[PDB]
Amino acid sequence: RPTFYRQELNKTIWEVPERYQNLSPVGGSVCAAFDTKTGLRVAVKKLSRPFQSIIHAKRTYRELRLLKHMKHENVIGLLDVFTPARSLEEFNDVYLVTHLMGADLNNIVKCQKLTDDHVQFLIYQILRGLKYIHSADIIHRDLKPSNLAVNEDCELKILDAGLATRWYRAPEIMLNWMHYNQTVDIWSVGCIMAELLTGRTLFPGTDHIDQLKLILRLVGTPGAELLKKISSESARNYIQSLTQMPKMNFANVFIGANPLAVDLLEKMLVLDSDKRITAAQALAHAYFAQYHDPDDEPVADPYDQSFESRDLLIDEWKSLTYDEVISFVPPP
Numbered sequence: 001r002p003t004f005y006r007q008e009l010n011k012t013i014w015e016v017p018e019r020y021q022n023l024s025p026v027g028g029s030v031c032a033a034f035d036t037k038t039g040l041r042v043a044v045k046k047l048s049r050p051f052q053s054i055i056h057a058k059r060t061y062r063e064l065r066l067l068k069h070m071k072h073e074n075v076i077g078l079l080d081v082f083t084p085a086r087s088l089e090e091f092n093d094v095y096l097v098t099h100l101m102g103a104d105l106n107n108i109v110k111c112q113k114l115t116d117d118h119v120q121f122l123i124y125q126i127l128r129g130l131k132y133i134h135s136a137d138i139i140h141r142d143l144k145p146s147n148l149a150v151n152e153d154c155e156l157k158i159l160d161a162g163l164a165t166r167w168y169r170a171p172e173i174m175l176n177w178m179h180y181n182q183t184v185d186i187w188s189v190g191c192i193m194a195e196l197l198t199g200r201t202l203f204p205g206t207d208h209i210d211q212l213k214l215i216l217r218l219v220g221t222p223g224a225e226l227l228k229k230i231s232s233e234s235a236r237n238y239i240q241s242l243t244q245m246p247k248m249n250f251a252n253v254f255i256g257a258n259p260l261a262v263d264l265l266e267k268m269l270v271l272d273s274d275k276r277i278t279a280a281q282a283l284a285h286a287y288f289a290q291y292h293d294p295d296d297e298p299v300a301d302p303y304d305q306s307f308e309s310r311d312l313l314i315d316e317w318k319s320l321t322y323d324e325v326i327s328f329v330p331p332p
């Protein structure tokens with residue numbers, strides 16, 4: 001068991017192994033550090049109240065299980081996980097170590113006007129990461145530029161897959177909607193991609209209803225085919241009672257965009273989820289021909305998420321988390 005040291009950063013106590021030096025607050029809470037073992041910068045996240053409620057204990061476990069599963073180039077994976085605690089009984093704090101990428105896609109759009117080649121490369125990588133996440137039957141659920149780390153070479157990693165602004169949220173989630181599927185992530189990609197092209201937020205809503213109104217201005221009120229699938233009576237007139245609008249021609253909205261980019265946007269930004277392109281299909285779209293390699297777009301091992309159905313006591317979630325900490329095997 002390594003030697004730990006204690007330090008206080010912004011009135012928070014960090015107790016970490018010595019291998020991690022130069023702790024520096026970036027935002028539980030996150031510290032940048034220097035990993036003397038690999039000679040790289042890392043982010044060390046101390047979880048805040050890991051075991052305070054059943055709901056919290058379960059989400060701490062969820063977070064760890066997810067991070068331990070992710071083994072893909074475009075998905076952030078777990079570099080280390082540790083606790084000061086010897087024994088389960090002293091177990092109270094959880095720290096997660098990941099690659100510090102240095103910028104997010106949000107910081108990047110506000111400076112660089114992005115070229116078409118950059119948008120191909122950036123969206124390609126998001127989709128390649130999503131093909132992997134979705135093959136483990138995981139939904140990101142909150143894909144957005146702040147969840148996208150990008151380095152000097154515009155190489156990209158997806159943060160927080162499966163863990164959860166409303167600007168990138170699919171309409172079905174904005175309206176609650178009993179049960180939705182992985183296609184909500186593709187709506188998000190459409191929103192990101194549009195903004196990487198124009199430099200502007202696609203649907204910068206003020207609140208919830210304003211968001212929905214902007215979405216309908218672009219894509220139009222639902223067609224008869226979508227309305228047939230809507231089982232709830234009230235949702236059905238809450239609809240036929242928002243302002244009647246036609247679908248805009250995206251060729252006319254994203255002027256001066258590559259026509260293949262406009263075509264793929266048309267296939268992502270569809271109200272009806274059943275008709276949205278999938279991550280795998282998109283990777284095969286003519287827009288990424290420079291980047292697509294069918295032999296290098298891997299799928300995930302299966303992810304056992306049965307725990308999601310269970311209602312356990314804080315102590316049990318806590319012991320399950322402790323088992324995961326102990327069983328952790330670091331990457332090559």
Ligand SMILES: CCCCCCCCO[C@@H]1O[C@H](CO)[C@@H](O)[C@H](O)[C@H]1O
Pocket residue numbers: 171172175177178179180181216222226229239271272273274
């Ligand atoms: C503005 C009105 C919102 C319409 C959004 C409905 C599109 C979501 O699409 C719907 O999603 C469900 C899964 O979530 C599917 O079971 C339905 O078949 C599909 O039409």
